[PDB]
């Protein structure tokens, strides 16, 4: 199944933050309405924050996370969780190798902000 694609409420600010846990240098692309809105890159095996940013979901609300290592797409896992019908997390893990820890880049999207 498709992973890393989320429908947000339209025209809403959201946070996106990425962590790295891999020997591979991670590139995280965040698309809003099928256009790149943010790109994080970094390398860490200790959960370093490789990027954090505030974006707007725009008129479509469509947000897609992509993860690659030197141009090679990682395999993604994702879900969305809502707490007390208000607080939203869109969660992404990614696997660039064979050990299947799926933490090689970890991406957290959260909304609402403010």
Q: Which is nearer to Ca ion, 26 or 88 (CB)?
A: 26
Contact by Cβ (8 Å): 12, 111: yes
Contact by Cβ (8 Å): 25, 42: yes
Residue 70 CB, nearest distance to ligand ZDC (Å)?
Answer: 12
Q: Taking the CA of residue 102 as centre, how many other CA atoms within 13 Å lie in the half-sphere pointing to its CB?
A: 9
- Residue closest to 8 by CA, chosen among 71, 72, 64: 64
Binding residues for Ca ion restricted to 49-108, rule: CB under 5 A: 95, 97, 99, 101, 103-104
- Contacted by 59, from ligand ZDC, Ca ion, none: CB < 5 to 8 Å by type: none
What residues line the site for ligand ZDC (CB under 6 A)? 21-24, 45, 96-97, 99, 101, 104
């Amino acid at each position: 199944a498709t992973q890393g694609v989320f429908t947000l409420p339209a025209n809403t600010r959201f946070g996106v933050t990425a962590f790295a846990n891999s020997s591979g240098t991670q590139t995280v692309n965040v698309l809003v309405n099928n256009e790149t809105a943010a790109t994080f890159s970094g390398q860490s095996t200790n959960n370093a924050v490789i990027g954090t940013q505030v974006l707007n979901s725009g008129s479509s609300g469509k947000v897609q996370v992509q993860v690659s290592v030197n141009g090679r797409p990682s395999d993604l896992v994702s879900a969305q969780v809502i707490l007390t019908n208000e607080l939203n997390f869109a969660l992404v893990g990614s696997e660039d190798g064979t050990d299947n820890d799926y933490n090689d880049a970890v991406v957290v999207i959260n909304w609402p902000l403010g």
